[PDB]
Structure formats: C-alpha cells, structure tokens
Design an enzyme around this catalytic site. Structure first.
Site, mmCIF file in Angstrom:
data_model
loop_
_atom_site.group_PDB
_atom_site.id
_atom_site.type_symbol
_atom_site.label_atom_id
_atom_site.label_comp_id
_atom_site.label_asym_id
_atom_site.label_seq_id
_atom_site.Cartn_x
_atom_site.Cartn_y
_atom_site.Cartn_z
ATOM 1 N N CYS E 154 -1.599 43.636 -38.592
ATOM 2 C CA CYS E 154 -1.792 42.878 -39.873
ATOM 3 C C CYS E 154 -0.430 42.085 -40.131
ATOM 4 C CB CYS E 154 -1.424 44.304 -40.809
ATOM 5 S SG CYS E 154 -0.227 45.254 -40.447
ATOM 6 N N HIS E 181 7.876 46.597 -44.146
ATOM 7 C CA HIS E 181 6.407 47.021 -43.753
ATOM 8 C C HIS E 181 6.375 48.287 -44.481
ATOM 9 C CE1 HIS E 181 2.844 46.658 -41.427
ATOM 10 N NE2 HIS E 181 2.998 47.907 -41.234
HETATM 11 N N1 LIG Z 1 -2.470 51.276 -41.440
HETATM 12 C C1 LIG Z 1 -2.443 50.119 -41.672
HETATM 13 O O1 LIG Z 1 -2.377 49.646 -42.727
HETATM 14 C C2 LIG Z 1 -2.998 49.198 -40.688
HETATM 15 C C3 LIG Z 1 -3.067 48.002 -40.581
HETATM 16 C C4 LIG Z 1 -3.555 47.063 -39.605
HETATM 17 C C5 LIG Z 1 -3.795 47.518 -38.568
HETATM 18 N N2 LIG Z 1 -3.831 49.222 -38.307
HETATM 19 C C6 LIG Z 1 -4.211 49.817 -37.105
HETATM 20 O O2 LIG Z 1 -5.604 50.477 -37.572
HETATM 21 C C7 LIG Z 1 -5.516 51.549 -36.548
HETATM 22 C C8 LIG Z 1 -5.953 52.782 -37.420
HETATM 23 O O3 LIG Z 1 -5.285 52.611 -38.555
HETATM 24 P P1 LIG Z 1 -5.323 53.853 -39.679
HETATM 25 O O4 LIG Z 1 -4.487 53.829 -40.643
HETATM 26 O O5 LIG Z 1 -6.775 53.883 -40.084
HETATM 27 O O6 LIG Z 1 -5.184 55.308 -38.812
HETATM 28 P P2 LIG Z 1 -5.422 56.705 -39.194
HETATM 29 O O7 LIG Z 1 -4.587 57.500 -38.178
HETATM 30 O O8 LIG Z 1 -4.664 56.744 -40.640
HETATM 31 O O9 LIG Z 1 -6.742 56.913 -39.360
HETATM 32 C C9 LIG Z 1 -7.507 56.995 -37.726
HETATM 33 C C10 LIG Z 1 -8.749 57.743 -37.759
HETATM 34 O O10 LIG Z 1 -9.334 57.861 -36.629
HETATM 35 C C11 LIG Z 1 -9.327 59.282 -36.203
HETATM 36 N N3 LIG Z 1 -9.466 59.375 -34.882
HETATM 37 C C12 LIG Z 1 -8.518 59.060 -33.908
HETATM 38 N N4 LIG Z 1 -8.816 59.095 -32.839
HETATM 39 C C13 LIG Z 1 -10.079 59.346 -32.807
HETATM 40 C C14 LIG Z 1 -11.123 59.549 -31.670
HETATM 41 N N5 LIG Z 1 -10.628 59.674 -30.458
HETATM 42 N N6 LIG Z 1 -12.313 59.727 -32.012
HETATM 43 C C15 LIG Z 1 -12.559 59.645 -33.173
HETATM 44 N N7 LIG Z 1 -11.892 59.502 -34.119
HETATM 45 C C16 LIG Z 1 -10.503 59.508 -33.899
HETATM 46 C C17 LIG Z 1 -8.329 59.779 -36.895
HETATM 47 O O11 LIG Z 1 -8.292 61.252 -36.866
HETATM 48 C C18 LIG Z 1 -8.453 59.396 -38.111
HETATM 49 O O12 LIG Z 1 -9.498 59.774 -38.936
HETATM 50 C C19 LIG Z 1 -4.466 51.607 -35.924
HETATM 51 O O13 LIG Z 1 -4.567 51.010 -34.652
HETATM 52 C C20 LIG Z 1 -3.448 50.781 -36.852
HETATM 53 O O14 LIG Z 1 -2.227 50.201 -36.001
HETATM 54 C C21 LIG Z 1 -3.387 49.720 -39.284
#
Ligand SMILES: NC(=O)c1ccc[n+]([C@@H]2O[C@H](COP(=O)([O-])OP(=O)(O)OC[C@H]3O[C@@H](n4cnc5c(N)ncnc54)[C@H](O)[C@@H]3O)[C@@H](O)[C@H]2O)c1
Ligand SMILES: NC(=O)c1ccc[n+]([C@@H]2O[C@H](COP(=O)([O-])OP(=O)(O)OC[C@H]3O[C@@H](n4cnc5c(N)ncnc54)[C@H](O)[C@@H]3O)[C@@H](O)[C@H]2O)c1
Ligand SMILES: NC(=O)c1ccc[n+]([C@@H]2O[C@H](COP(=O)([O-])OP(=O)(O)OC[C@H]3O[C@@H](n4cnc5c(N)ncnc54)[C@H](O)[C@@H]3O)[C@@H](O)[C@H]2O)c1
Lengths: 319, 337, 75, 337, 337
Positions: E154, E181
């Site tokens: 992001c 952030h």
């Molecule tokens: N948080 C943000 O605002 C943001 C911004 C840009 C990019 N990202 C990227 O997005 C990705 C996810 O962000 P998020 O906040 O949604 O993460 P999160 O941890 O809040 O949610 C991830 C979800 O995926 C599930 N999960 C994890 N491993 C899994 C697997 N092997 N099989 C099935 N489900 C699985 C988790 O249990 C959870 O439900 C990361 O790479 C993060 O760096 C996040």
C-alpha cells in the site's frame, strides 16, 4: 457418598435427549454415564448361533455388573468391559472412576433385584408403538436408507418377548413416562404433537409427587383464556390419582405444543412441589437448549421435571 | 414554521444541525441562528468535516464571515459569551437550544428569555426545579407555557425508557446503574488542572470514574421512583458510543427470557423509534449513528433469584441524544402556544 | 460408511430369508430382526455423529488451540 | 528450595518472572525452566523491555540460544508445543506454572504430571472440578496431595476477598458484578476471524462486552454462595489495569459509611496485603504495579434501601494477579508434602 | 465474465468484497469463491459489520454453513490452509486473489496454479522476481501470459504515482521516504512473542518503527530509479488511514508552488482517479474511504535550495489499496488471454 440413578428404555444407550437434559442440569463433571449394552455375554455371532436377541436374561453377565455396581459404592475405580458396537464383539475393559452421581441405563437396569435394592432412584421410559413407527420413518427417511415398511413387520416381531422381558420392570420403577399420539390434533402426521404422561409413584420418601392444584383428584386444565391467547391447538393438561399395577400413582399429563414463552411460564407457575430453588427454573432449563428434539412439547417438560426430582433426591441423599 | 436558534455550536450543536439537515422536509423548525466562540469560517469546516461521522455528503457547506450557506439554505451566525447582548428579537427567535453546558441554572438560561427569546430548551440536567422531559416517557405531559424546559443527560435519556418499561411490567423497588461512558469534551487531554480531580487526568489513557446524579433524573421524569435510583459512570477511552449497565430489584419475579420478551414487544408497540432490540452479537462501533436512544443488548440480560434483573443498553451519546433533542423540539413546535 | 452399509443390506436379505423359511414367529428370526435393528441403530449413531461434523474450529482448535483465532481468556 | 517451571512465557509468565526477580531473597522457589513458542533470544528482550512496566532496572538480562542469564542467575529454556516431550524429570521439576491459556482441562494439565512434573499450578479457571484456591480467602484449605491446583481468573481473584468480607459482616443473598476489564491478548487487533464473535472485533476501538463465568468461581471458592453470583465483563481500550463493579443484595441493613469502615478495618487486620483501602480520588493509571489484589475505591460505595450495596474495586490484572500466583506458589512451597 | 476467487478473507479480502459489491454493474468479474480459516457463519458477520467502514447498507448479507448470500448473489466458501486441496477446477476459477500474507513466494503462490487456477494476483510485495504492477503507473505493460502478478504494498501503491510525476517533470537523483503508517494486523496487541522484535510490542501504545523495502519497489515499477529510493515506516496508534512523507532530490530546480501546480494538472489529465489534490486543511480521519490512492496534501509541500523537495500524501491502506486491487483485476479481465 455414592448416589445412583436408573434409566430404562430402548432409545439407544446414550442416544436419548433426557441424558442431555441431565447433562445440562448436573454437568458431566458431577455425573458419569454407564451404558448397559456393555455387559453382554457373547456377540451377534453367538446371538445368531443361539438364536437369541439382546434382551435375554441369559444374554448378560448380571453378576459381574452387580459386583462392579457394589464396588462403586465403596469408592474404587471400576473396570468395565465395552461392547464393540460395530463388530458386536467385546473390548478389553476400561478403568473408569466413580463420581458424585452415577447413572445406569440400558434395557435391563432393573431386572436384577439386588440392584433394584441398590438403585436410589429409577425411571422407566415408555414409548407407544405409533410414535415408534413415526420415529423409524424419520430414521429411514432422513438417512434415505430405503429400508422402510418391513421394519413395520420388525416391530411386532420385536414385540412379544419385549413385553415379557422389559415391560415388567416398570412395575418397580418410580417414574414412568408414556408418550402417546395426540388426541387433540388429528390433521398432522402421527408423530408431530405428543400426548405425554408421567405416571409417578407415591410411597418411597424423599420423592414427592408434582400435583396440579390438588393432591389426588383428577383435574383437566386448559390454560387458554383471559391471559393467554392460544394458538392451534394449544395445550390441554391433565392430572389424576390412579392405582397402576396395584400401586398408588399420580399421573400428570400434557397434550399440546408449546409455541411461545408465556404459555410455558404460565404453566410452570401453577405446578406444585416441583422442588425449585429458583422461580421459573424449569422454563430456563427448557430454553437453555431450543434445538433439542421435543422441547416444544411436553416431553421436554416431563424429562426436566424428573431430572429436577433427581436433584431433590440428590439433595436428600447428601444433606 | 418555527424559527429556532442554537447556543453553542459544539458536539451537540453540530449533531443537531446535521440531524436537521437530514430531517429537513418533515420539519416545522427552521434553524436561523447559531453562536459559538469561534468565527463563522471555522465552524462551517467543523460542520462539514466531522472526524466522527465522516464527511457530510448530502448538501454543500460554505461560509463567509457573517452567514453560513448550508445547501443553499442561509443561516445567521454571531459570536458572544454574554447572552444578554444577543440579537434574538432582531432575528425573531421562538426557541433557542441551550447547548453550552454553562447556563444550567434557571437564572442563567432565563437570560435568553430576557434578551428576547420566547422558549429555551436546554440540553443538560439543569440545576433547580427546571421541568425535564424525555421523548418516549413523558414528552406529552409538558405545559406549553413552560418556556424553559430541559432535556436530561444522555445517560438518563437512554436509561429512562427501559426503566419505564420494567416499572410498568414488573414494578421496581430499587435500582442501580453503572454506565460505561465515552469520554466527553470536559476532560483534559493530558493531566491538566481542572475543577474536579478525577476529570483532571488523561482521557485517552484512563478509565476515570465519576459520580453522577443523572440516574436520579429518572426519578424526576418518573415521579414514583425518586430517591430509589442511583449510579456512577465510567469514562473509558472510546470516542463516540457508550453502554449503560442497569441493575434493578423488581418485586414481581420472572426470568431472563421474559424481560427480553417484554422489551421486544415494547419496542414494537409503544417505544418504537426509542428502543431498538438487537439479538446480534454486535460491539460498540456498530452503534455509531443509530437512531434509537437505547439498543437493548439481548444476550447479556440476566436475572438472579427471580427478583434481581440486569440489562445493558448501547446508546450513542452524540447522535441519538441529538435526535431526541430534535424530536422534543419538533414536538414542542407541534404544540406551540 | 461402507462396511455396515453392506452389512445392513446383508442382514436385510437374511431377514427376508430366515423369517419366511424357518418360522415367521419364533426366537430365531426375532433374533434376526433384533440384529438388523441393532445394525440400524448403529447406522443411526453414525448418522448423528456425522451430523455433528464440525467444519473447522473444533479441528484447528482441537489440534492447535493457542492460535489467535481461538484464544479464549474467559476472564 | 523448590525448583519451579513456567509453561508459556506470556504476560503472566513475564510478570511472574519479574515478581520473582523482585522477591528473590525471601523465596523458597528457584525458577529453573521456561518454555515459550519463541526462541530464547526474543523473550529475554521481551522480559527486559516491557512496554507496560518500563525497562527492568535491578538485574541484568541477557541470553544465548540455550539459557537465559537474569542477573547472573541462569535459567533453562526450551520450546515445544507438545507438553509430553518436555524435560521435566531431566530438570527436577516439582511445580510447573501453567500459563498458556490452553491446558485448562484436567487431562490437559495432567500431561505435565505424566511427563515428569510433581505439581502443577494453573493460572486459569479450569474446566472440570479442579481445586481452586485464592490467596486471602482459602489459601489454607488445600490438601497438599492435590498436585493439580488452579488459581482463578484475575476478576475472581480481585472480587472474592470483598465478597468474603461482605458475606462475613453482613450476609449476602444475591450479587451481580460488571467488571470494566482491560483488553487482553485474546482479542484480535483489527477485525479478524475468531471463535467468539464479540472478541473478533477491534480491541483499540471498541467497548466489547463478554459473558464470563468468573463471577461464579466465587461460588467455588466460597461454597455457600454458589449459584448466587453472576456477572458480565466489559473490555475497554485500556491496556493494563481494570475496575470491577459489584452489586450485592445484603440482608443485614446498613449505610454506605459502615461498609467502608468494615473493609477499612479488614484491610488492616485480616486482608492486609490483599485489599488496600484508598480514600483518594485516583484514576486507573495510578494502579499500574500496585501490590494489592483489590484497591477499594472509597468515594463510590453506595447503599440504596439499606439492603443493596455497590462497591467498585481497582485491580491490576497483570501485576497483582502475578503477585497472587507467586504467593500461592510460595505458600504451597511452605507446605510441601 | 471472469470467475474470480479470494484467498484469505481478512482486511483486504473484506474490503475487496465490499468494493465489488459497490462496483457490481460495471464489472467483468464475478466473485464466486472465498476461503478463510473461519467458518462461513462468522465472516459474513464480519463482512456486514465492519468496525471501520460501519454497517454495510446497500445489500443484504446472510449465510449458512456452505454458501454466503450477499444481496441475493450467492458465493461459495470453504476453509483450508493447504492451497493444494482446494476446489479450483471444480469451481472454474480464472483469477484467484492471494491476500493471506503467507504465499509471497513464487513457489507458494504457484500452488494455486498447480491446484487448478489460471491466474493469481497477489496483494503483497512478493519475494523473488514476480512481475509487479501498479495501477496508474505501469498497469499497461503487463504481458497477459504472466499469470502470477503482484500488486505492491500500500505504501508503494501510494508513493509511486507521485514519484512518477516528479520524475517525469523534474528528474530525480535520489529520494527518501518515511511513511507514518497505521497499525496493521501483524502487530501483537499486548507485548507478545513475535518473530521481529519491533513488531512484538504493543500496538495501541507505541510508535513502533520498522524497516521496509517497499520504497525499493518503486525501483521495480519504475526501472530507472532502482537502488535510489529507500525509506522506513512508523506505525502509530491510528487504526485506518496513513500518511507518507517523501523527500526527493530533484536536479531541475524549482519552487514549492510549481510542484503543486504540476501535480494538480497531473491529477486532472493523467492520474485522474489515482491522485486527488486537496488544498484543504484536513486531517487523517477525513480520508477514511477516499477513492484515490494518494491525496497530496498541498499546504505542506516544501522545497529547500531549489533541488530538494518534500511532499506528503494521505492514503488509506485498507480502502484505496483494495480499490487498486480491484482496478488491476478488472484491467486484467479486459485483456484476458
Ligand atoms: N493491512 C493493510 O491495510 C494492508 C495494506 C496493503 C497490503 N496488505 C497485505 O495484505 C495481506 C493481508 O492483509 P490483512 O490485513 O487482510 O491480513 P489479516 O491477517 O488481517 O487477514 C488475513 C486473513 O487470511 C487468513 N489466512 C492466513 N493464512 C491463511 C491460509 N494459509 N489459508 C487461509 N486463510 C489464511 C487469516 O487467518 C485472516 O483471516 C498481507 O500481505 C498484508 O501485508 C495489508
Ligand atoms: N458530549 C456529549 O456527548 C453530550 C451528551 C449529552 C449531553 N451533553 C451536554 O451537552 C452540552 C455541550 O456538549 P458538547 O460536547 O457540545 O460541549 P463542547 O464543550 O464540546 O462544545 C460546547 C461549545 O459551546 C461553546 N461555548 C461554551 N460556552 C459558551 C458561551 N458562553 N457562549 C457561546 N459559546 C459557548 C464552546 O466553546 C463550544 O464551542 C453539555 O451540557 C454536555 O453535558 C453532552
Ligand atoms: N492477560 C491477563 O492479564 C490475565 C489475567 C489473569 C489471567 N490470565 C490468564 O493467563 C493465561 C495467559 O495470559 P497471557 O496474557 O500471558 O497470554 P498470552 O497469549 O499473552 O501469552 C501466552 C504465551 O504462551 C504461549 N503458548 C501458548 N500455547 C503454548 C503451548 N502449547 N506451548 C508453549 N507456549 C504456548 C503463547 O504463544 C504466548 O507466548 C490465560 O489463561 C489468561 O486467561 C490472563
């Protein structure tokens, strides 16, 4: 101390919701469950060789179960064998320990007379053959096994020795719950609404009856009226003193379907000697599990009433 | 059409203005005057960009140094701390909405009546025998010659409909409450000097407790329970919404399901639009901007010993309270005398 | 189920055979129908346990409870 | 000298280690083993730099990949999730301190007893009839052959001494509680998937309510009140300390000053070191690191109708609870069998 | 119409689903499969009640244990952590949206390609030479046989359009950045054990710094600046939105007004819908839910010595990033091969 509770019925051992309501009442910490198909003598192979059902007084080691049952009173951890149900065979036993509350349930929890002298409180659970058929239709309909309508001919073949082997035990139980087709509702399938009745026995102290407005004069009460707007078909209670098998009993009887809350608290406010430390406690014990089968009719009422009398007997036994 | 005014364009004032902008067509009220201690350039920005309710979207907000144009609708605006130098009769003001948190006395609030206003609705539990009215309990029983009326606090405005329902259905002997309250503007941000010591401490850091008499205001709006209701408040670091715990000692015994049934049907017959009933497992931030003045949380209602009940009620003390203020203002417009 | 799935139909074949052939009302085929009803009862016990098949939580918290999806500090 | 161990080097484990480092000389306990799911390099850093209790100052903390040197004192450390593969008899462990929040059952906690440990003290309200003991109420009445003992939750550990004092002095019919609880590690930070829905939501944003049975654990540690005490909990965005509201229905009538007098003298005769009594107008963050397991807030105690009392008690659920764990551990060391 | 799927129904997944529910009519994408580690009953609740974007309003959300009905539209749902046991060819999946934060490698993400999916779009800066594409910079230059594409972080997705504009207009020698952030889900709530020590500490309490290579990802998406862009990140206790500072060393000298003019006209010619330009004195929470991937804050742009420029850019890392993910997904649907 060791207390003991005898349950009798062919609903499958550990396969009836009355044990589930007892679990919600006591807790599996305070009580343990003992099936009684485990004390079978020999297997379904030897049942086929000897030509005998699982209902024979030959078919169980009634003495070793008595020895473990008497050793239950003395505190020691019992070693009970296990009927391997899929194979029909017998497991090498499991060492289980006694608890605060011990239950006994099976086809013959009460056929022995020394354990009939041992059991602190007894329950037979009767079923009429019509709702047997209505439950087996649901049994082979939900599973879709396609084995129906010759199980009808299995019923009356299972019948005659069953009336010889099992049904004379109810002449010694305290409380017996019969479940009938409803006289009230006619245009349904034959197993929706139940006409249930808990023939309870006087005599043996500690066990009070639960009487509706009067001890010992038959009273058929319909709670519909100025304060309850009854749906179709509503409830129709009953009560009556009686002498069943030459024994002073008091049938308390419910026909109908509980559709909502106020009609189930209004009934509970008028039963007497129900032995609650808590107002509406029977209604709370009804509605802690809305998903249980038979909560919407009198079966779930009567089962928890009997379990509440079991609380009363336990408090009598433990001071 | 009733020309109304707003004293103090703070949280309650901005929410009142936003509510009237969202309930414009069905209104006998036209907002024609506001006054804050800020210039008219700043508070128009604070009206448009609320950091709690987001950016306002429906109408356009702009201003110059003498008026504020909200969606084409003009509104006058001035700045003075003395209520006696204010152009009320020059503007034709029937009802002024006292929302400064300063003028809680009768003699303080009556300065607007002296300065040329006809009725004053003060959004605070006022000192002295000011007639208090809660929408949904006793918004009918006001005499229209009572020009100085008071809405109670937000906690009382949430709690009193539940207490009305439980008093009518069961009868109440005694009752406690403990509202877990969102932090308000009175608390100092860092540890700064303040008149009361428990509000002097940091707001974002602390559960600060406080003693309130707003539980006793239910005894004003329900007369037969006065001197029987008391409670404290807990300010926790959440910015917007709050929850109130309520322990009553009823005398007609019952169970936990039946009181939920009573409040559920009271939500659909009499308290409709006041009390919402929710059988969801929601949390606090799912009530930002809810229209009801009390959402009863169903799964937590409990009864011990038959005669001792506890309910909890979510309520938004910045939006729903403004809704009840505007409903009381329209209801006094509908019975103008 | 495959084993008892076959065995129930086998005992049903026997229920058609032994209680039309060797006496419709005696202890032998009553034992046969009693056996077939017990096979049906264990089909029922298998059916109810497969109705209570958990999807994920009573698996992933069965084996690994302290993951953030099912820590419960019931405090 | 009793060789003790720590299962799970989380908040309770780090606070237990820090308490034993601050109570070293008077100790019959020597901490010789810990195990976390982290390597020994990380958790030594987390021990030294706590973002709640500041930097540890008295002793030096360092580690390598097999041991941790705390102030010159060496302690062993390993990492495994299976409790059955753990070197207990290889290390000579009398008492292991279960603090993972995982092994609450008897069969779970008894895995350490099977794997070669002699007694286990679990810091959670355990499932099943595990003997529970609270320091200050019934820390005497344990049988030393009970190797699997349980301390209750922090809320119960705070609430039960107050309930003991009020039950002895006045007699209790019924009683509610509503603890405003600090957020714990079980809640997800952002809105993430979780087994219970009200803990699935954001912790820094929300008052999340939860139902607890930890009020009923007072009915375990005080037997004649079981089935008479129930309450809920409110998790608010404060990181460390919490307050518990408690509404009891006593039967011997009294006033608000007398219950304060009773608890004040009970603070100085019997509950010394358990209950502190404070007539100050403090707030939450002035109880970070207090040694008592309940600070009674004096100014908020109130009685309505003579027979209905409300107290509130500050308590630190991360430091004082660890203090009671260590006191129970030393008290079972003093009666080793 | 392209049948698409979502791996990991977390913050990015819920925002992706909500965006597609708000951009349904203009979509060549139909969302047909999701999988999370939770049951289908819970995540439908988490979709409907977001504690950041409020309650969803436009369509009805319900579920049972096998499917989820969003506004009448059915969507399948399953739960497995192994990507190899997943019904992709059984469901007919062209594009799966990797959003677990786990499968950042090529060999990890290619497990879906092996298991029966045609293209994968991973929402993370992937390890290894995965082709990365940012909407608004180089969303044209992807080859449609590249089935494994990566959107960047992001921070990169915000920063790279500004760096593109300033590199085209002025030419960049070097450049730093320091993004303030919002806290993400990876940080532990209380001080718990974690792989990196600066993410192990409390999120609501602390400015935790972290080193990121997401500044270098601009050197991937703009090739002639690789090895010239580097920066750190600061995680502060705000839940949703964030701001990025950017210090570039341009070589064509200019003043602070001219770079604002350049970015203002680039907002209206080429970067329309990517970069918004705001000459208001807004603050962070007025950008919750903004559609642009970078709002340039105008009043803070400054130039020292002619050849040293600093800009700051508000951006929502949970909503605008999801918007760019969905725009990239539609843009790869429009050039399906
Ligand atoms: N948080 C943000 O605002 C943001 C911004 C840009 C990019 N990202 C990227 O997005 C990705 C996810 O962000 P998020 O906040 O949604 O993460 P999160 O941890 O809040 O949610 C991830 C979800 O995926 C599930 N999960 C994890 N491993 C899994 C697997 N092997 N099989 C099935 N489900 C699985 C988790 O249990 C959870 O439900 C990361 O790479 C993060 O760096 C996040
Ligand atoms: N904060 C809440 O959510 C809430 C809920 C219910 C009731 N209330 C009551 O509403 C009142 C105001 O609440 P608020 O949050 O808007 O307060 P606030 O302090 O946030 O805003 C009050 C505004 O009035 C201005 N003001 C104060 N004295 C003034 C004067 N003499 N002349 C002109 N302007 C003056 C202030 O400068 C500020 O602009 C208080 O009585 C409060 O208790 C508040
Ligand atoms: N949080 C409080 O303030 C508080 C208060 C009173 C009681 N408690 C109880 O204390 C317990 C732990 O609290 P906490 O805050 O330290 O928890 P936590 O989750 O913050 O820390 C627990 C630690 O144990 C580790 N762990 C978990 N399962 C493990 C296993 N099988 N093997 C090895 N390590 C394992 C975790 O990874 C973590 O390192 C819970 O039962 C909680 O309810 C907590």
């Amino acid at each position: 101390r060791v207390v003991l509770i005898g349950v009798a019925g062919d609903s499958g051992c550990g396969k009836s919701t009355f044990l589930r309501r007892l679990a919600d009442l006591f807790g599996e910490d305070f009580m343990t469950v003992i099936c009684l198909d485990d004390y079978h003598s020999l297997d379904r192979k030897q049942r086929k060789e000897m030509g005998i059902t699982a209902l024979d007084p030959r078919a169980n080691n009634f003495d070793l179960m008595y020895e473990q049952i008497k050793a239950l009173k003395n505190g020691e951890s019992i070693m009970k064998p296990i009927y391997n149900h899929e194979t029909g065979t017998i497991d090498p036993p499991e060492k289980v320990d006694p608890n605060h509350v011990i239950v006994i349930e099976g086809l013959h929890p009460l056929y022995d007379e020394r354990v009939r002298s041992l059991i602190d409180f007894s329950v037979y659970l009767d079923i009429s053959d019509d709702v047997k058929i209505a439950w087996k239709i649901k049994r082979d309909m939900a599973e879709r096994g396609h084995s129906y309508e010759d199980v009808i001919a299995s019923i009356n073949a299972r019948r005659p020795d069953f009336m010889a082997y099992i049904d004379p035990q109810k002449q010694y139980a305290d409380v017996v719950l019969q479940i009938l087709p409803s006289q009230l509702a006619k245009e349904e399938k034959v197993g929706n609404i139940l006409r249930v009745r808990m023939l309870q026995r006087e005599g043996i102290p500690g066990f009070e009856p639960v009487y509706l407005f009067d001890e010992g004069s038959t009273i058929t009460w319909i709670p519909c009226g100025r304060k309850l707007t009854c749906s179709y078909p509503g409830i129709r209670l009953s009560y009556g003193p009686d002498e069943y098998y030459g024994h002073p009993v008091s049938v308390l009887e419910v026909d109908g379907r509980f559709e909502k809350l106020d009609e189930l608290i209004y009934i509970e406010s008028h039963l007497s000697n129900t032995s609650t430390k808590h107002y509406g406690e029977v209604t709370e014990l009804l509605l802690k599990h809305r998903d249980y089968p038979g909560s919407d009719n009198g079966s779930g009422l009567f089962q928890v009433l009997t379990g509440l009398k079991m609380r009363a007997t336990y408090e009598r036994l433990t001071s | 059409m009733v020309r109304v005014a707003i004293n103090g364009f703070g949280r309650i004032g901005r929410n009142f203005m936003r509510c009237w902008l969202q309930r414009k067509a069905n209104s006998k009220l036209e907002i024609v005057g506001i006054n804050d201690t800020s210039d008219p350039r700043t508070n128009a920005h604070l009206l448009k960009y609320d950091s709690m309710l987001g950016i306002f979207q429906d109408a356009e907000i702009t201003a110059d140094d003498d008026c504020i144009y909200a969606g084409g609708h003009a509104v006058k605006c001035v700045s003075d701390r003395n209520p006696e130098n204010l152009p009320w009769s020059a503007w034709g003001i029937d009802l002024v909405i006292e929302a400064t948190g300063v003028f809680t006395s009768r003699e303080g609030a009556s300065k607007h009546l002296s300065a040329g206003a006809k009725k004053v609705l003060i959004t605070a539990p006022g000192k002295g025998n000011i007639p208090t009215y809660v929408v949904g309990v006793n918004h009918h029983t006001y005499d229209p010659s009572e020009d100085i009326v008071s809405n109670a606090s937000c906690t009382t405005n949430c709690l009193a409909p539940i207490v009305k329902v439980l008093h009518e259905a069961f009868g109440i002997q005694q009752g406690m409450m403990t509202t877990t309250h969102s932090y308000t503007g009175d608390q100092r941000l860092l540890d700064a000097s303040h008149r009361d010591l428990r509000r002097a401490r940091a707001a974002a850091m602390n559960i600060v407790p406080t003693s309130t008499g707003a539980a006793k205001a239910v005894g004003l709006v329900i007369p037969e329970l006065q001197g029987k209701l008391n409670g404290i408040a807990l300010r926790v670091p959440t910015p917007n919404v709050s929850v109130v715990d309520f322990v009553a000692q009823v005398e007609k015994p019952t169970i936990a399901e039946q009181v939920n049934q009573v409040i559920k049907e009271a939500s659909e017959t009499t308290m409709k639009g006041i009390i919402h009933y929710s059988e969801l497992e929601l949390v606090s931030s799912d009530y930002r901007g809810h229209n009801a003045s009390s959402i009863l949380d169903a799964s937590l209602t409990m009864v011990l010993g038959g005669n001792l009940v506890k309910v909890v009620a979510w309520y938004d003390n910045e939006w729903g309270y403004s809704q009840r203020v505007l409903d009381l203002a329209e209801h006094m417009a509908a019975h103008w005398a | 189920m495959s084993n008892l799935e076959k065995q129930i139909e086998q005992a049903r074949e026997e229920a058609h055979k032994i209680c039309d052939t060797e006496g419709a009302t005696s202890g032998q085929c009553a034992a046969a129908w009693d056996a077939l009803e017990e096979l049906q009862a264990e089909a029922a016990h298998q059916r109810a346990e497969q109705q209570d098949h958990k999807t994920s939580f009573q698996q992933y918290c069965d084996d690994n409870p302290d993951a953030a999806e099912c820590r419960i500090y019931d405090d």
